[PDB]
């Protein structure tokens, strides 16, 4: 009926994928997930005539756009599109609507891999995934305002591989993406490949935006996971149930300790979550000097007769 937009956020990190390769019994798992993504994009473009596809990778040294290709294509030596430098990666008897998009994205994949190999000497401690789906929502709104309507949806191809834990800098931008996606009613679908069973922030992202979370552990047969569950278009979202069996608690980590929080305290100025009363009677975040009376009232003992 109404066409949609399939925006996809790919998490490419050499350390994460290679630790998945080492933990797994196979090498070259990203080729498998790449071709699974390609046939997913072909399935999405087969779903409707007018639906569109965006794919964005979040590499170590930043983010780059994979489809649609950057507008520097000028039918020149640096065009890098269509028959210009058309290196034979996929077969030429493909459907041309599929052929153009798949060939362009795999050329951009190889170009990103060349650029990341050229900067293999520097190891980034910062993950660019949160800014990646931030720009994904930005392009979603670009398509929504340019084309009048059209639905939209996000897919997240993330990987933990038991090496990267749940980071602290990935708290605020993820919920900014959650509220933005809730504003444009864009579902957020997340599949996590790796040994780490639970990713709490992404679980809340799927739950709060009417999306689906599915953690996976084997690179084989992932298109069953994708085209079985990740294909719920926004046209039929309310009439299809979700396989998101994992139940998230919508909790948070404490600031000065880091553990998952229970009934506790916050600063009434900087509003960070504290499992216990911080030392020095001052905030660890905004250095707000606290009244001794109120923390005496919170340190006050409950009463029972002798």
């Amino acid at each position: 009926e109404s066409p949609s937009l399939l925006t996809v956020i790919i998490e490419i990190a050499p350390k994460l994928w290679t630790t998945f390769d080492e933990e797994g019994n196979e090498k070259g798992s990203i080729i498998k997930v790449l071709e699974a993504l390609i046939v997913f994009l072909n399935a999405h473009l087969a779903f409707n005539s007018a639906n569109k596809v965006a794919v964005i990778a979040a590499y170590s040294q930043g983010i780059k756009y994979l489809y649609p290709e950057s507008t520097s294509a000028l039918k020149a030596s640096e065009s890098e599109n269509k028959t210009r430098s058309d290196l034979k990666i996929i077969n030429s008897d493909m459907y041309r609507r599929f052929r153009n998009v798949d060939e362009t994205l795999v050329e951009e994949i190889y170009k990103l891999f060349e650029l990341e190999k050229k900067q293999i000497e520097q190891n980034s401690q910062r993950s660019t995934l949160a800014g990646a789906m931030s720009a994904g929502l930005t392009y979603v709104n670009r398509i929504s305002k340019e084309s009048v309507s059209l639905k939209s949806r996000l897919l997240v191809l993330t990987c933990g591989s038991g090496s990267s834990k749940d980071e602290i800098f990935q708290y605020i931008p993820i919920m900014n993406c959650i509220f933005s996606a809730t504003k444009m009613k864009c579902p957020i679908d997340v599949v996590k490949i790796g040994g780490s069973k639970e990713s709490t922030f992404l679980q809340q992202t799927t739950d709060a935006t009417n999306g689906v979370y599915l953690h996976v552990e084997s690179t084989e047969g992932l298109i069953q996971y994708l085209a079985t569950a990740m294909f719920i278009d926004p046209s039929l979202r309310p009439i299809i149930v979700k396989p998101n069996h994992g139940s998230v608690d919508f909790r948070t980590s404490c600031y000065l300790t880091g553990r998952v929080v229970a009934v506790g305290f916050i600063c009434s100025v900087c509003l960070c979550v504290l499992s216990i009363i911080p030392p020095g009677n001052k905030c660890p975040a905004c250095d707000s000097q606290f009244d001794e009376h109120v923390i005496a009232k919170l340190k006050r003992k409950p009463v029972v007769p002798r």
Binding site: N42, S49, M94, Y95, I223, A227, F231, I232, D233
Partner: protein, 452 residues
């Protein structure tokens, strides 16, 4: 309409013909688009897995808010022969059509396509300068032929025989003119993609010869939908049957082959327009005094305006016309009903009557909030005049047939009258007058009832 029309056409296709039709990946990809999105989702979920899935899993997949949509999709896919229902272990096991599944997987995974999508020869021009106006000219040729305006270029005899065998476009050669039916202006109601669809379903209803099969026609039209405009394609993949329809729609203008028997055929923009869609021209202005001010410059819009509006003048912007009684009589003698003309006026109304219409609806709701009225974009005076003209066309109505009278016994009259009423051919009856009339179509049935 469009999706329902092609679905009902492909319902008429036999199951073995449908299974032979599912061979090419282009046909499977085209019919995949014609499924409902719930049906499309379930089919593509069933595509990649060789194991067969019970119907209870698909039923549990759907929320209770879309149970009716799920049942409608099940009806559509069962009628489309895409499911093999299997009875095993007390369960109605469901299996996808294997040829359809294989061809669709090849269309997705880049498998065997047997050049169903054509081949590019990398010699091509821009569509706007050569292809687009050729397609527009070839479409407007048959349009301006069928509306009846004189032309210097007339189409080929094939489309003439197609229109003659069609329900619309009744023809007479002893008079020297081509009569437009109601179905003709009904064809002019919808937008050109569904016009092309109705044209091609009438074509397939026409072509029953041994010279042409069916699966090749469907393959060719679905790959024409699959082709892209601005790149030529080689004629070698088509069969000689598909080549003679390549010539046939080259005459139509769906495809531009620059010369006959050439090896390069250029798809026109109508080929992509056929699959799915995407102040305007033809936006008209009507007043209380039946005046016509049309923001139109295409000859086809004002040509079809000429059938029911007495045109007085034509600017580079306007076509000065007036809704006279005689123009409406010209419309109604063609079978063109008044409500369809009213709908045409509503769809082609200028946005200024739209803003004044929402203004007067705001006045109506602020004056009488207890009742709501539909948005009359055009004033009801002209609509009432058109309805009065329609009614005065048929002030008396003349139903022809036969009448039985002269019954000496009331029981014979009553039995014949109730027999006529039961078969729904009686128009009047009374035992006092001892007469009852039956229609012309019901004459022979009652005559053989009385003879036996």
């Amino acid at each position: 309409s469009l999706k329902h029309s092609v679905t009902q056409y492909l319902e008429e296709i036999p199951q073995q013909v449908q299974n032979r039709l599912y061979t090419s990946p282009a046909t499977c990809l085209a019919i995949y688009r014609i499924l409902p999105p719930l049906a499309k989702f379930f089919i593509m979920a069933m595509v990649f897995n060789e194991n067969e899935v019970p119907l209870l899993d698909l039923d549990k997949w759907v929320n209770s808010n879309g149970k009716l949509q799920f049942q409608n999709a099940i009806k559509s896919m069962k009628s489309l022969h895409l499911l093999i229902p299997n009875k095993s272990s007390g369960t109605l096991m469901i299996n996808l059509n294997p040829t359809f599944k294989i061809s669709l997987r090849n269309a997705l995974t880049g498998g065997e396509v047997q050049n169903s999508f054509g081949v590019v020869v990398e010699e091509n021009v821009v569509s706007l300068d050569l292809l687009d106006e050729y397609s527009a000219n070839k479409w407007e040729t048959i349009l301006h032929f069928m509306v009846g305006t004189p032309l210097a270029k007339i189409p080929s005899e094939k489309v003439l025989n197609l229109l003659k065998h069609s329900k619309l476009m009744e023809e007479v050669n002893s008079t020297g003119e081509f009569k437009i039916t109601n179905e003709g202006f009904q064809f002019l109601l919808q937008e050109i993609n569904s016009q092309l669809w109705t044209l091609l379903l009438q074509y397939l209803k026409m072509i029953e010869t041994s010279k042409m099969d069916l699966v090749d026609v469907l393959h060719f039209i679905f790959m024409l939908g699959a082709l892209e405009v601005g790149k030529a394609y080689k004629i070698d993949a088509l069969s000689e049957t598909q080549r003679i329809m390549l010539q046939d729609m080259r005459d139509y203008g769906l495809v531009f082959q620059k010369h006959s028997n050439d090896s390069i055929f250029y798809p026109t923009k109508l080929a992509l327009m056929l699959t799915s869609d995407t102040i305007p021209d033809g936006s008209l202005i009507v007043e209380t005094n039946f005046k016509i001010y049309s923001y139109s410059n295409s000859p086809l819009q004002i040509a079809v305006l000429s059938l029911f509006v007495h045109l007085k003048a034509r600017f580079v912007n306007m076509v000065l016309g007036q809704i006279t009684r005689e123009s409406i009589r010209r419309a109604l003698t063609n079978g063109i009903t008044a409500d369809q003309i009213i709908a045409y006026l509503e769809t082609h109304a200028h946005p200024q009557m739209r803003r004044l219409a929402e203004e007067k609806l705001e006045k109506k709701l602020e004056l009488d909030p207890n009742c709501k009225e539909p948005l009359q974009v055009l004033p009801p005076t002209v609509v009432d005049q058109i309805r009065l003209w329609q009614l005065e066309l048929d002030r008396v109505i003349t139903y022809e047939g036969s009448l039985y009278s002269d019954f000496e016994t009331s029981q014979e009259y009553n039995l014949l009258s109730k027999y006529a009423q039961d078969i729904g051919v009686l128009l009047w009856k009374d035992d006092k007058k001892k007469k009852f009339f039956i229609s012309k179509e019901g004459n022979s049935q009652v005559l053989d009832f009385a003879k036996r």
